[PDB]
Amino acid sequence: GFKQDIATIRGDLRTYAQDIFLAFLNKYPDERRYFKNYVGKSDQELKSMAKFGDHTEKVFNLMMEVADRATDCVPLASDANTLVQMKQHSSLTTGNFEKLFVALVEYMRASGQSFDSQSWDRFGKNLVSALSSAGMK
């Protein structure tokens, strides 16, 4: 289930973080505009840039913390607030987060590995509601 999925992802965090992030950018290419230093760079070029592996792992580490602190896929409002008031997220809307979770779920469903993808979808919906409540447009 969802708790096992957190363990699966954490076990190989750098690989899953990179693969899911690239799945997100591939499905929604116009989203790459928010990551100016990744424009025009192939996947292998990205993975040789220190900040790409660092960014992505840290993003997914925080996502996994928020996921682990949730109850029945309902995140803490305090965690939603952290995400909204990060300077790096200042120009985002809940739609950018909905896109990430659509890509993450699609990726889970397409993988060899046995994810509770319904629960990630629900977590994503609950997180979007909470981001909105914490002031994200």
Ligand X SMILES: Oc1c(Br)cc(Br)cc1Br
Which two tokens mark 46? 């990205």
CA 36, 39, 49, 103 torsion: positive or negative? positive
Contacted by 58, from ligand HEM, its own copies, ligand X, none: CB < 5 to 8 Å by type: ligand HEM
SS3 assignment, position 112: coil
Candidates 18, 25, 55, 105; binder of ligand HEM (CB under 6 A) is 55
* 50-69 vs 77-85: helix crossing angle, rounded to 10: 150
The residue assigned the tokens 């809307």 is 93
Please tell me what DSSP assigns to residue 127. H
Q: Does 10 bind ligand X (CB under 6 A)?
A: no
User: Do residues 122 and 95 lie in contact, with contact meaning Cβ atoms separated by under 8 Å?
Assistant: no
Candidates 6, 92, 102, 134; binder of ligand HEM (CB under 6 A) is 92
Q: Is 51 annotated as a binding residue?
A: yes
Q: Does 129 bind its own copies (CB under 8 A)?
A: yes
User: Do residues 105 and 124 lie in contact, with contact meaning Cβ atoms separated by under 8 Å?
Assistant: yes
- What gap in Å lies between CA 49 and CA 40, rounded to an integer? 13
Candidates 8, 82, 126, 132; binder of its own copies (CB under 8 A) is 126
Residues 95-124 that bind ligand HEM (CB under 6 A): 96-97, 100
Where along the sequence are the contacts to ligand HEM (CB under 6 A)?
Answer: 31, 34-35, 54-55, 58-59, 62-63, 66, 83, 88-89, 92, 96-97, 100
Where along the sequence are the contacts to ligand X (CB under 6 A)?
Answer: 20-21, 24, 59-60, 63, 96-97, 99-100, 103-104
Where along the sequence are the contacts to its own copies (CB under 8 A)?
Answer: 71-74, 122, 126, 129
